[PDB]
Structures are given as C-alpha cells and as structure tokens.
Amino acid sequence: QARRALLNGQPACATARTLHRDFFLRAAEAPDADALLYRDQRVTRGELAERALRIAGGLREAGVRPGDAVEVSLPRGPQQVAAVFGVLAAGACYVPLDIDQPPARRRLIEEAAGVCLAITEEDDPQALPPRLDVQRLLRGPALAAPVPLAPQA
Amino acid sequence: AGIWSNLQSVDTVPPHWRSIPYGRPLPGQAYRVVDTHGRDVPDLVVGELWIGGASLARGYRNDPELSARRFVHDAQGRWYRTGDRGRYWGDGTLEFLGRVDQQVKVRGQRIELGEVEAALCAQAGVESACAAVLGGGVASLGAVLVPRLAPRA
Amino acid sequence: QDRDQPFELSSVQQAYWLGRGAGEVLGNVSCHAFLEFRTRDVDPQRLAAAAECVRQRHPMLRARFLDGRQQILPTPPLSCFDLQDWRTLQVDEAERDWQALRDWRAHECLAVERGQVFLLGLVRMPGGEDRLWLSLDLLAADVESLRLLLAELGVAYLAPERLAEPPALHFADYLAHRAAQRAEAAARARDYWLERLPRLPDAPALPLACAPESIRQPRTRRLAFQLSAGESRRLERLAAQHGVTLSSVFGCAFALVLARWSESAEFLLNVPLFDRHADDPRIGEVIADFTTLLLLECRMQAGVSFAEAVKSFQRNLHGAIDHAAFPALEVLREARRQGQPRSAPVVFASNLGEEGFVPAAFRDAFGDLHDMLSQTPQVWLDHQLYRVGDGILLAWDSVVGLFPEGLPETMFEAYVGLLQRLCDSAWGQPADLPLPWAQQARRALLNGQPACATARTLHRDFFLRAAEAPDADALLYRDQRVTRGELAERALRIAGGLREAGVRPGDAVEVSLPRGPQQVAAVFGVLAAGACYVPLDIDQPPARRRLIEEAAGVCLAITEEDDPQALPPRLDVQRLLRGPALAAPVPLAPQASAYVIYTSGSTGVPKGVEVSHAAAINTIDALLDLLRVNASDRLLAVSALDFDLSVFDLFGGLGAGASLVLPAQEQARDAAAWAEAIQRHAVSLWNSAPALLEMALSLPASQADYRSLRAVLLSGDWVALDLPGRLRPRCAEGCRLHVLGGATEAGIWSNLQSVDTVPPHWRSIPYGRPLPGQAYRVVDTHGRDVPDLVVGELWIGGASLARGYRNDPELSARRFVHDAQGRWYRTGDRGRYWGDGTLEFLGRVDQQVKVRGQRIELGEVEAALCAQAGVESACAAVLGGGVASLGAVLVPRLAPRAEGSMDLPAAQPFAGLAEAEAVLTREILGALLEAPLELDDGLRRRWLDWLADSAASALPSLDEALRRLGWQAAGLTAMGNALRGLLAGEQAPAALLLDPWLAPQAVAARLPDGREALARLLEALPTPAAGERLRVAVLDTRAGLWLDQGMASLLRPGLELTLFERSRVLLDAAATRLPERIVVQALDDGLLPAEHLGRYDRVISFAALHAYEASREGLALAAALLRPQGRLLLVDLLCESPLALLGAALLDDRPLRLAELPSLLADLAAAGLAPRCLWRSERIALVEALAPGLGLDAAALQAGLEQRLPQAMRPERLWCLPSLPLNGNGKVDRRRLAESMTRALGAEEPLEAHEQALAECWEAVLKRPVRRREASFFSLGGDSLLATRLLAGIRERFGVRLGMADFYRQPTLAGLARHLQVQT
Ligand SMILES: *P(=O)(O)OCC(C)(C)[C@@H](O)C(=O)NCCC(=O)NCCSC(=O)[C@H]1CSC(c2ccccc2O)=N1
Ligand SMILES: [N][C]([C][S])C(=O)O=P([O])([O])O[C][C]1O[C](N2[C]=NC3=C2N=[C]N=C3[N])[C]([O])[C]1[O]
Ligand SMILES: [Mg+2]
C-alpha cells in the first residue's frame, strides 16, 4: 500500500484550464508557425485559430452554447481540426465521429448524445440534430476569443 | 479516463515482461486493482483496474446508470472500474492482463462484442448472436447467428 | 401606512442593516448586489432617463434606511446613474480604471442613509464596450425582486411607454399586513425554535485563515461556474426523477461540500427564500425585499446515496419553511438571548426562477449577466444561483482572506465536481464527495513513504553492536559506565533467569526498576528472553500497579525485590543477573509483542498499548536513518521507561551503538543533573516531551552547556513556537530539532517536523510528514478523509501500529479501525492537513468542549495566554462544579539577572541556642518516649537513638536552654502532652501542622530565636512609617498560629494582607483566628488564583521554602505574587530547628531539601528577585528581595484576553503556577490541572454613576428592571437591533462614541461602562 500510494499519489502535473486554451495562446504567440501539414499543403496556427474562431462564431450563430455538445463528422484534414477547435471555442463539447460512421449508428449516437448540432460538410437543418457544412461555418464571423469555459466543462 | 492513464517508458524490454505493462500511472492520476468486492488486491494478484483521480471522464453523456456502474466512489476517491484485469508487480509496475468481459480490440479500435451481437440482433430475422475476435495471424472479428423461426401449428 | 413616514424593517432587512455596523462580526458592508453586463453600445441618456424612471416607479428603489427603520423619499438626493464615458482613453488605462471602478462599486457600502439603495452605472470602454453595471443594496430588494428591477430597466431603456403601471402595493402596507398576518405561525415557530436552540448545530465549521471578527473590510471574492444547458437539463431531469425542487439539489450538494469541509457534518445555512406572497398580484412586480430567511439546520448524512441525501435536504428545507414563519434572524437573536453565539454565516440563495435570472426584456437590452458580486455582511460564503443563458451560474461569494488561499477555489471545484458527478451519473451513487484529487494525491505521497526500515526483532541490532564491539560504551550512569558486551551479557543473564522463571516468547513481563543500567539490562533481558516488557515507574502507587499487573496479564515482574508469591511472581533483577546466560537472544519473528506501555490508571482500567518489534523497529529505523545515529552518539534518557520515547533511546540508540546517558531515579526530572550529564558525557542526542526540554533550557547557557547536542527530538505534547528559537544557541551548531507526532499506539512516533526555525504562519509546531513506513489520515467522524485545511480526527496507519490494548480487544476494535486504506489507530487528536501536505495537530478531541453555547478551542486559549507579557507557559481546561466552568493557568518567566551579591549578618545567634534546641529535642523525644507506642517501630528506634545523638553527646546545655528558647518548662510539658495526645490520635501530618507547640515552621517561629527571626522579617513593612496602603501576602500560612505569634509586628495601619497555603484544613485555622481585614485563600491542589498576581507589594515566607519541591518552585510562586518593585521577605533554613526536624521526621520528609545562602540567592536571582541577606546566621537566615516587571496581574490578563479572545472563551476563572505539573510520561499534566482548578473553584446593584446611567439606558431599551450590574445585555434581552438603540441612547445620555465591537466583547454593564470611564 505504501508503494501504491506513491504511484497513485503522483502530483497533478497540470494546470486545470479549458482544453483549447493553449492552442489559442500558441496561435496568438506565433500566428505564422505551421500548425497543420496535410496533402502537401500547410496551415499556420493563425490560419487555424481564425478558421476555428469563424466556426465558433458560426456555431454561436447556430444556437450552440457553453457545455452544450456538437457532433464533428468530417473527413480527416484541417477543416476537421478547425471544427473541433471551433466547437471548443464556441464553448461546446465536441462529439467526434468518423464520417464513415454508418447512418443508423450515427442516429443512435446523435440521439444518445442529446447533441445540439452536427458538423459534417452536409447542410441539413432538418436532420436529427441540425447538420452543418464546415465550409459555411468557415464563412462565419470570427469570435474575437474562445468562449471562457471553466476547466470542468 | 482521459486520453491515457499510465506510461511504461521502453528504452529496453527486460525479459520477464510477458507484455509491456502499464507503467507507473501518469502524473495526477492513479490505479487501483480490485477484487470483485472493491477492496484492493495485493501485489502480483490479478484484479480489476480502477483508474482514478483528476484525469477521469465525468461519466457517460446520457447514461447515469452505466456511469454509476463504472465511475464509482470510495474512501479512496472516484474510480472508473475499467473491467481491464491486471496486477501490481512487486516493483509497483502495473501489468495489464487483458479483459474478463465482452470488450475486445480490432485493428487497435475498441469494440464491445455485445455491440456487434446487438447490431446483429437488430437484424430482422436474428433471434440472438455471439461475436468473438479470432485466432490466426489475421486477428479477425467473427460472429455467429441464431435465426428466429416464425412458428406455426 | 403613511407612504413617506418611517416604517419597520422586515426581519431580514434588519439582518442586512445591522450587518452594515462597523463593529458587527464580519460587518461594515452593504448587502448589495453588484451586477455587471456587456454590450458594444447603449445610449447613456436613455439609461439616465431609464434609471430615474424606475426610481420614480418603485417606492423601494427610493427608500432611505435610518435608525433601523425605512422611510421613502419622493426622489433620493444622491445620483441615480454613475456614467463613466471613457470612449477616448487608452484601452488598458481604461481597463485599469474599470478594475478600480469595479472593485470600488462592487465592494461599496451604498448610501442607504441618503436613500441611494439603488445605483445604476456604465463604463464606456474605448475598446467599443459599454459595461452597464448595477449596485443595488438588497435593503431595497430580494434577488428575486432585483430581476424585476432588471425587467423594469429593460423596458425603461427600450420602450418606457410600455411601463404600463407603477406597482400600487406599498411595502409598508405589505409589512403592516404580513407582520400581523403571520402572528400565530410566528409564535408556533418561535416555540419550535426556542426549544431547539440547545439542539441547533453551529455555523459550518470551515477552515478560516482569519477569525471573522479579525477583518473590518470584507471584500467578496466571487467564484463562479456556468453549468451549461445540457448539465442544467441533466440536473433538472434527475431532480424530476428523484422528486426534488432544483434548489434542493443544489442546496443538498452545497451542504454536502460544507459537510465535507466542516469539522462536523451538522450546521446552519441561511437559505434566503422568496416570501412574495400577498393578496395583490402586483406583488409580482413590486421591487421591495421579499426575501425571508430560513435557518436551515442541515445535518448531512455520510455514505448514503445522493438520492437519499437530496430527499433529506428537501424534507428538511420544505418542513423548515413553516418554521421560517419565525424568521432566522430572530432565532439567531434568541440564541444570543440564550447565551449561544450561533450564526448561519454561510448562505444558499437559490434564485433559480425558470425564465433566466436576467429577464428577457433586459437580455434584449444588454447581454446576459457577465459577472456579479454580493457584499452580504456577517456571511463568510454567500452561495447563490442564477439561471444564466438557459444554463445555471453557480456563484460563491466567499470573503477575501477569511478562508485560506485556494480553499474556496478547491471547495468550489469540489462543488462543481460534485454537480457534474450529479449530472452525468445516477444519484444511487454515494453522497460522499471524493477528496479533490490534488489533495488526496499529496496525502497518498505522505502516507506512501516506503518502510526505510528492515523488519527485525527490536533488540536485534544491540546484540549485533555488542558482538561487534563489546568494550564500547553502552550506558553511562551516576558515575560508572557499562559497555555493550557487559550490557549484552547482563541482559542475556537476565534472559536465562527469565526463561528459568517460565517467561517465554511474547509472554509479558513487568519491568519496575529504578532508572539505571539494571533497568536497561532488564528490558534487553526481557526482550532477549523473547518476552514482551511492561515497563512501569517503581514510584507508581500499589493499587494502580495491581491493576496493571492484572490488565497486562503479566507473566512475571522484575522489581528489584524477590516475591515469587505476589500477584505476578516478582523478581530481583540482581538475582536474574545471577541467572544463567543465554547463548543468543531467543529468536522472535518481529511481529511478536515487544513492549506494553501504560497510560495513567486514573483513566479507569489502565490502557496498555502492546507494540510489536516490527512496529517499534520500523519507527526506530525511520528515525535513526533521519538522525544518522552513529557509534559516537550519546543520548540522554530523560524519558521514563513507561514513556515510549525510552524505546527509541534503548533500541534505537543502542541499536546504532549510540551510548545512553541515563539519569538515575533521583535525577528523573532534575534539569541540573541532566545539564551536568550533557556537559560531562558530551550528550549528542536528546529525546523527550517538550516540558522536559523547556525545563532543561530553563537553566542558563553558562550553568547548562548543551553545545554537544547534535540533534534533538521532541514529542508527545505541544511544542511551543519560541522553543526552537531558545534551543538554537543552546544545542550544537546545526541544531537539528525534530518535533515528532502521534500516540504510543503507533509505536514511539509517527511524524517528524524538522525545525531549523519556525516559519511565521505556524500557530503550533505541526506534525510534519509521517515518518517513513507509516501514515496519517485526518477523518470526519464517519471515517471518511477530511480535505486539506479541514479539522478532523487524526488516524495513524501502517507499519508502526501497536497490536492493540494488551488485554482489551473491545477497546482495540474502537480505537483501531480498518478501511480500504488499511489499518488505522484512531487517535482522538484533532488536526488538519495544510495545502503543502504538512499536518497541523490541534490537541486531543476533549481539548475542545461544547461549553454551554460555544465550542472552546482550549489550545487557542493557551496560545492567547502565552502571548501575555512575561508568560513562560499556560494551560486551559474545562472543569467540574455546577457551572462546568472554563479554567486556565499561567506561569511567568522570571528575568534571571545575577543580582545575588551579599553579606550575612551572623552576629546574633550563638551555640548555646543550638544546644538549647538540642536539649529541647532530647526532652520532647523523651516526652513522646513516655508513650513510645504512638510511633511505628522504625521511628521508635530513630527517636530512641536521637535521645542521645541529637542531644548532650553533641550540643549540651543547662536550664539556660529554657531561657534561650523563651518557652519554659510549662512549654516543654505542653509540647510533650500535645505530641503524645496528637500521636495517640496518630494525627501526623495534618494535626501536627495545626499545632502551636509542635508545627514545624511554628516551632521554628519560637525556638531558634524564631519570633525574633519573624520580628526582623516583619520589620521594615513600611506602611506605619509611610502612612499609605500596602498589600502584603504570606506563602506558607499553614495554621496561622506562627503568624499570630508575630501578629503584633504585622497589624500596621494601611496594611492589607492575603494568606496562602497549598493545603485547605490548615487555612481554616488561620481564617478562624485572624481579623476580617486579613484575607485567606488556598493554593488548592497547588494552584494560585490569578487575582493575586502582581497585587502584593510585599510577600512573606517562613522556614518553609525547602517545603516546595524546588527552590525555583516557591521562589517563582513568590515572584509571580509580587507587584513590580515589591519585596519578598523570607527566612530560609540554612540549618533546621532541631524540633522542626522532629516535625519533619513525623511527616517522615527528608532534611536533604535544605540549601545554603549562595544556593538560595543564585536561584532567587534567577527568579529575578534582587536580594539582601539580613539575619540569624547559618540557622534561620533572613533574606529580602526586590521583584522585576513580570507583568502578570488579573487586570493586565483581562486586557490581554479582551485583546485576543472572543467573550465565549473568557478564562471564567484564571490561575497561576511556578511551573506546570508533569505527567510520569513527561507531558504537561492537563488532567491534574483540570482537577486542581476543579478543586480550586469553590445579584448586586450598579454603584458607579456610569453603571447607573447605563442601567437607565438598558431599562429604557429593554423595559425589564436593570437592578443588577452583573447581567450581560443580550442575556438580559438585548439584540444587535437593540444595540443600535443602546448606542444612540448612550449618544444622548453621555455623548461618547461607543466602539460597538468592544461592547460586544464587553456585554456586561461595567464592561460597557469601560468606554464611559475613559470618556471615549
Ligand atoms: P441583531 O438584531 O441581528 O442581533 C444579534 C445577531 C447575533 C443576530 C447579529 O449579530 C447577526 O448575526 N445578525 C444577522 C446577520 C445575518 O444573518 N446576515 C445574513 C442575512 S442574509 C441574505 O439574505 C443575503 C445572502 S443572499 C442575499 C444576496 C443575494 C444577491 C446579492 C447580495 C446578497 O446579499 N442576501
Ligand atoms: N508519549 C506519548 C506518545 S508520543 C503518550 O504516551 O502519551 P499519549 O497521550 O498517548 O500521546 C501524546 C498525545 O499528544 C499527541 N502528541 C504526540 N506528539 C505530539 C503530540 N501533541 C503535540 N505535539 C506533538 N508533537 C499524541 O498523538 C497524543 O494525543
Ligand atoms: Mg495518550
């Protein structure tokens, strides 16, 4: 029990904060740095933070709000990463699914998650959750900052 | 438990490892290993890995009853009750020993065989199903069906 | 009710109003809500018009608060709208100005005395942001009424034409209705609450960094957490499933946090509920204060499901709404009127109105609530809730600096953690919170510390150290030293002697030997026999010894005597040393019992703590490996053998081959003997209770040089904060003090706070980290761990626990307990972790008592007495008697000052006097020997020898003896007759000490020119020359007959006299015979009442300073009793009266107590008294000596205790001592102090003009007749409401500006007169 209380007792080694906080800091600190590299093109932290904050503004415009949840269902690539940061920066909890996740199973998850919205390249405001094009959320106005989430959201 | 809960560094494998163990718990989070009655098992004894401390998920998104079955509370705080089996070796390392239950790994991903079986019972015409990950180098997921017969006199 | 005339405050408005009081407990603040809101732009003139429009709509926004009543203005004098247009400024200067404006108007006491209960305002930031904000004093309004003010502002900003109707129901008509309408319900609930006041729980016993009385400027710090839509939905649907109002969910979860953070899970929390019930539906639009305050006595159960806990909280909450018909404030008043300081300074304001807190008409006009602040007075933790968005803003308006830093943060993080644990998981789960993981993670490291020990039999290493180096020093004694080989072969001789006597592995053996090498050889011999040693003091009384022999089930006793026929077979250690040697120690597996150490058998059946070798050697290694103990070290065994510290001295010290300097049994508490032992044998290690090292350090650095002392261990009792500071220059360079924690039930110790010096945040030296291999918990009464900073019971765990109480398994299951965390000794120490993982110990659990209306922190009373000028040390206890009084005790430090230079007037005595007393000694020896059977045979033979030895064979004289003595042959006859009659009654000591012819100091007050000694002692009492009042006292009064013999020299005009003795029956005679101008008071059970400190300009001692257990004892008693510049007047026996020596032989008390003139004057100058010797040569030597500024006086103590303690822990009686008495096991004897005070315990009109003119003020305000001064205002019938009318009454009656906090510390009539006496 002594050994195990040491190994369990290992101190927090963390600063409790909103999960996105640090990326938006790394972006504000070096907007030009390569955040993403993808299919032989690249995205800066500034570009990604803006793309995310535009998605966030599009999500607050689409009725998403702090600790409410948002499905993200995008092919693997920068728009996916921008969307999860944009969900988190809208204050929301992202509910990732593969775009390959099949429709009846996706409906079990969309039903069980109580999900406010889904981000999917498809626009369909009449889906089980309202379903949204990330490319349209990328036309959204940028939020000037991520929404202040307390660390436990 | 959050993205991980242990770290075995591996500069080399000492030959007595039957598997690469779960190492020390990651900082700020913890492991118990318990008897089926919730008390800690002694070192080298196999029991159920309870992950604990600050890294844990808050629960399942809209399943409070399964949350209470997993995210349990004890005189030692809050614990995820994983259903992984394992043992603390005498040096306080945590050998993970696979799972006792219907949950298995396919091409790295987590699958509940109860999910595969239920997705087969969701077939009109299946009375019940079994699923298992199989032997051979393919490591394939297999399943087995009982059809429902639509009786008459 | 006339709509602009003064009308009564609602009860809960009085709670805010009286909380504005600069002298009220955590008062001086508004009870305002500050709200803050954001938008890019708003028209400031629309706002200015809107704010003034809502004032002229609602009476209560324009209500003035004065004289504890409210009165409504047609419009207020002071500005409605604090516009601050900064659209031009630099952004960050505007932000700093906003933060100043924010901190100001969010902490602001609004001018409610000028009707400014409502104030709107607006910074216009140059960043393009109009931050509308709103300071509403809740004297106007409920929070549920504040959202209606927002509704009115939202409309009045956007479309003021739609403000269709100003709500016609005036708040005075609502009160004039409500206060009459409630009447039966209020009485019905008053009867409920009155009968519950003794049974009400406390405020939540949370960790406070500051006393609430010790801050005048309570800034609220808000903590907040927005539960989302989804978390709100999950709580709302789960609240529905479990059948509870959503306020009950949040209130239950809050009360579970406060329970987990309280010392006890039962407390009051003030629930402001929303009594917006009225006949007019427009009450739903009136802005006045519809708060009603519910004193929810929550009692939160542990380990139940949250589903049970929340239904319980709801049932309590709902049922208590009916009892809130008599308002919580009047319950808190009636508690004060019943002598209980109860409060609900923690608050649960569930403003959960389903629309969103900020109403939609306002959410259109400005963004939903950005931030907010309370300033609720007299409330530590104002928890509120708001629907925000469609989510729920949790808010905790904690107070800045009141809680520890990071505590409202962590406690609130646990509350949010709980509420998400309620969202995402079913309420069938335990209502017990987790410890917030960071706290538990640290404590898992502290408890996780590896064994750092090898499991082995406790004696093992000593027998190795002997086989390695047999000629090395093991023990150093009175003169001689025993080597390891000698000690090992002596131990193994005793071991074989014990095997032969039938003792065998783990069977228990008493070791009652005087401290010395044979005692050590006996414990190592018992342990080498494989047996378990049961050490006892040889001076322990026989009845207690039989209980311990019985209770240990003791196989055998080693006792320096053979009696194989006793309760156990009892053996002489010298015969056991004549026994055969064992070849080797009998093999024990380490888990076997090593010793059983016994507490005092005054506790009923003696608790004997059986410790295994594994446990003992674990603690020992865990300390040897920290002390780096080595073969050159030399410990001092000041620890008695029945005090478990000796186990480290023995099996630790000699396990490392470090030799023991042993005090002998006559040196068992002697600091001078220890000091020489350190200075002589170059002692490198020390180990004791702090009261022993305090006693060692009480000797000067020149008299007692400890600079050999490489490291110091202190244990078992509170270590004073100055003590490391006193110790650093005394011990070796690199002082290495360690203070060590925990009871014998955890082996010798369980903690180590290393001390270089005290960091200034300590209030006692804490328990440190647990020692290696063992562990601590602090637990709630339910056995769950309490959080950091939270006081609970200390539990000790792991590889050092005692096996149990030796033959009480039933108590062992109560005091040792078992969890998923392993096995724990449940100590009954209070204490708390700190954030850094240090473990503050806070006294035994009985060192708190729920005395008659409050929990007393007796450790805090001791800490506050130690802060007095000139105090060495203090104790506090709670007593017997019909009051069950608080009691406390002091000691002065005496300012040692080397004034002792002298000459002795030797010219008056001659040898024919000592011959006269030798003759009279022979005659009265011979006179008792006319009936020689009144003695025992030992005294008979002594007396028959002294009939020649104390007589003409040494100091012969003729009948001239009689004329030297002053008593003639009539007196010789009267002595012989009295002595035979008294001893045919056998009435020594008691009647011998009552007798004029025979009492030892009284015969010394005649025979040795004793009346002439007494005369020249009493002479120069200056009052019949000076014509001025003089206070005299006597230390050694006994029967008063020796004083009566001097009394013609004592009855001086202006002389006041007080008479003292450490005995009751003798003072009854003194009090019988001496006139009513002379006072008599016992030092009952050794204890001086504090009313006498610093009071006496003169103090008398007669032929009895040796009758104290030190010179330093009776001297320190004298010095404390003396007024500064006052004179001790002493005759000391540099030789006894030969008849007082018969007297002492009939007490059978040793003549070795007596001391020389330099020996007296050295200790007396160390007691600070500056001396002259004066008289009677080498016999009955007169000394007088002058007192320094010791500062102790009951007046000065009252002023210091008024400066440092609340009225609920006044030292209800107060006493003093020359030093605190000591346990056999080293501690300050808090039981003897408690019993002694319990023995020493044993209305009238106003008579000052200020008391009488105050009685007129109390009688005017309270109506009831103020005939008695001794009453306290609240106990008589006062309230904080009535304290305003009393202050204003004093401001009419006398004109003085009353400090209301000082009046709350001074609630009795003369205590109130204090501020009038000083014309404040
Ligand atoms: P006195 O006549 O009061 O008699 C003596 C006693 C001992 C009773 C006196 O010293 C005392 O304790 N007075 C009562 C103090 C008290 O109870 N204070 C708290 C009243 S509570 C209240 O309803 C607050 C808390 S929640 C709410 C609020 C919400 C939003 C924004 C601000 C505030 O304050 N109001
Ligand atoms: N010696 C001892 C043990 S160490 C004994 O014996 O006694 P007791 O009672 O049991 O114990 C003591 C008491 O107190 C406490 N402590 C310890 N340590 C200390 C203390 N206090 C204070 N400080 C310190 N350090 C214990 O636990 C008990 O209660
Ligand atoms: Mg004890």
Author numbering:
A (entry chain B): 538 to 690
B (entry chain B): 844 to 996
C (entry chain A): 99 to 1340, 1348 to 1425
Show sentences the authors wrote.
Briefly, this product is produced by a typical NRPS assembly line of four subunits: PchD, PchE, PchF, and PchG. PchD activates salicylate, PchE and PchF successively integrate two l-cysteines into the growing peptide to form two thiazoline rings, and PchG then reduces the second thiazoline ring to thiazolidine before the release of mature pyochelin. The adenylation domain (A) in PchE selects and activates l-cysteine; aryl carrier protein (ArCP) and peptidyl carrier protein (PCP) connect and transfer salicylate and l-cysteine using phosphopantetheine (pPant) arms, respectively; the heterocyclization domain (Cy) condenses and cyclizes the two substrates to form a thiazoline ring; and the inserted epimerase (E) catalyzes the epimerization of an l-cysteinyl moiety to d-cysteinyl during thiazoline ring formation.
The A domain (complexed with Cys-AMP and Mg2+ ligands) adopts the adenylate-forming conformation. In addition to the dynamic domains, the Cy-Acore domains between two chains of conformation 3 have an r.m.s.d. of 0.566 Å. After completing the A domain, the Asub domain is interrupted by the E domain, a noncanonical epimerase that catalyzes the epimerization of l-cysteinyl to d-cysteinyl. Notably, D480 may form a complex hydrogen bond network with S472, T474, Q482, and Y114 to form polar contacts with the thiazoline ring atoms. Intriguingly, in the PCP post-condensation conformation, in which ArCP departs from the Cy domain, the tunnel adopts a similar conformation previously observed with both EpoB and BmdB. Similarly, the “Y” tunnel of PchE Cy is truncated at the side of ArCP by the residue F372.
